[PDB]
Amino acid sequence: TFGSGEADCGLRPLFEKKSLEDKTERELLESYIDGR
Amino acid sequence: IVEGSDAEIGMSPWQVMLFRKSPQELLCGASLISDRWVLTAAHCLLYPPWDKNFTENDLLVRIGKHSRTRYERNIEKISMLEKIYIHPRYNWRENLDRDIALMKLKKPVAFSDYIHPVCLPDRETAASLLQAGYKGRVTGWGNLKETWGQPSVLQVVNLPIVERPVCKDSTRIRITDNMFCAGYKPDEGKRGDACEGDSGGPFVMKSPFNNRWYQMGIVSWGEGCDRDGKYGFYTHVFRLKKWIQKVIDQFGE
Amino acid sequence: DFEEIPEEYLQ
Ligand SMILES: *[C@@H]1O[C@H](CO)[C@@H](O)[C@H](O)[C@H]1NC(C)=O
């Protein structure tokens, strides 16, 4: 509700919570070079 | 969204539609950041040059949607607005600097598989992800082309953040530290952009550290849609976070 | 064009 709000924010019920990936999120992750 | 694709069901559960009561039309996108607060672009509500000045009684927010035009019975939730807060220094006279607004819902919305809030970035997440070349994602029900051309369901497109010098050199508009631009360059072979109807919507990124989605920007403005040598501009959410936290702390509950 | 929504939300 302002950064330090909602301990559950950003975790999608149909994806992260079930450990399923959407069709194109890998494209995002692959672009973050020098993080992982 | 231009050159995007159909979103999967539940793919952006924080996506919000700003809907005009009468006539009933799509006004802008927005995002759910908690059970009672929605974030959007100030210019979706207030823009004197075009005699635009909506009050809380002129609008409705529809949450959990997928189809652009249907009333998604038992899935979407429609909420009325209690109060609208525009940033006191939103510059509509010159360049849309600080193009941000908060909307307090009359009653908290219940979360579900289709309705869930996105996170707001903290200093380190912004520092680590807001870099040229890194891709974010934009979603919305806006036009599919600069001159339609309307999608049947929510569209999505992933776009790379562009170096500031390049953003500045693509427009005659004065860019500020409260904006960043995104899109592919003429020679990258890929394209895509937000368009009319998509403004106010979220530009999100997924943290590789904790796997959460963060809203880094708000679709703010652009010159045309998906034009070569031009880029979409976004409100820098982290730079304005103190204002956000301030409004929620004072008028929350 | 948009499907009408319930009256409840328009009052
Ligand atoms: C928008 O309308 C409100 C009252 O509804 C008014 O106070 C405000 O001055 C208007 N915005 C403009 C024209 O600057």
Both tokens of B163, joined, read 């170096």
Nearest to B71 among C1, C5, C10 (CB): C5
Give the residue from C1, A30, A11 showing the smallest Cα distance to B160: A30
Does the domain formed by B1-12+118-238 have CATH 2.60.120.20?
no
B contacts of C3 (beta carbons < 8 Å): 69-71
> What are the pocket residues of ligand 1 if the criterion is a CB atom closer than 6 Å to any ligand atom?
B 48, 53, 55
The CA-based angle B33-B132-B191, given to 5 degrees, is: 85
Residue with tokens 């997924």: B206
Please report the beta strands in chain B, taking only residues with DSSP state E, as ranges in sequence order: 5-6, 15-20, 25-32, 37-40, 46-47, 52-53, 59-63, 77-86, 101-105, 135-140, 155-160, 179-182, 202-206, 213-221, 232-236
Q: What is the DSSP letter of B247?
A: H
Q: What is the CATH number of domain B13-117+239-251?
A: 2.40.10.10
Alpha carbon of C8: minimum distance to chain B alpha carbons (Å): 10
Q: Helices in chain B by DSSP H: which ranges?
A: 123-129, 164-168, 241-251
Residue closest by Cα to atom 6 of ligand 1: B53
Residues 6+ apart with CB under 8 A from B246: none
Every domain range in chain B assigned CATH 2.40.10.10: 1-12+118-238, 13-117+239-251
From the CA of B46, how far away is ligand 1's center (Å)? Answer: 8
- What is each CA distance from B222 to B3, B163, B192, B193, B206, in whole angstroms? 16, 16, 12, 9, 24
Alpha carbon of B199: minimum distance to chain C alpha carbons (Å): 19
If DSSP states are collapsed to H, E and C, what string results for B119-161?
ECCCHHHHHHHCCCCCEEEEEECCCCCCCCCCCCECEEEEEEE
Structural domains in chain A, CATH included, are 1-36 (4.10.140.10)
Instruction: Identify residue A29 by its one-letter amino acid code.
Output: L
A 10 A CB-CB count for B138 gives 28
- What is each CA distance from B106 to A13, B20, B75, B245, in whole angstroms? 25, 17, 19, 19
- Whether residues B25 and C4 touch (CB distance < 8 A) is answered with no
Method for structure elucidation: X-ray
Tell me the C-alpha distance between B88 and B99, whole Å.
10
From the CA of B11, how far away is ligand 1's center (Å)? Answer: 36
Hey, is the C-beta of B188 within 8 angstroms of any chain A C-beta? no
Tell me the C-alpha distance between B157 and B133, whole Å.
15
Query: At how many Å resolution was this determined?
Result: 1.9
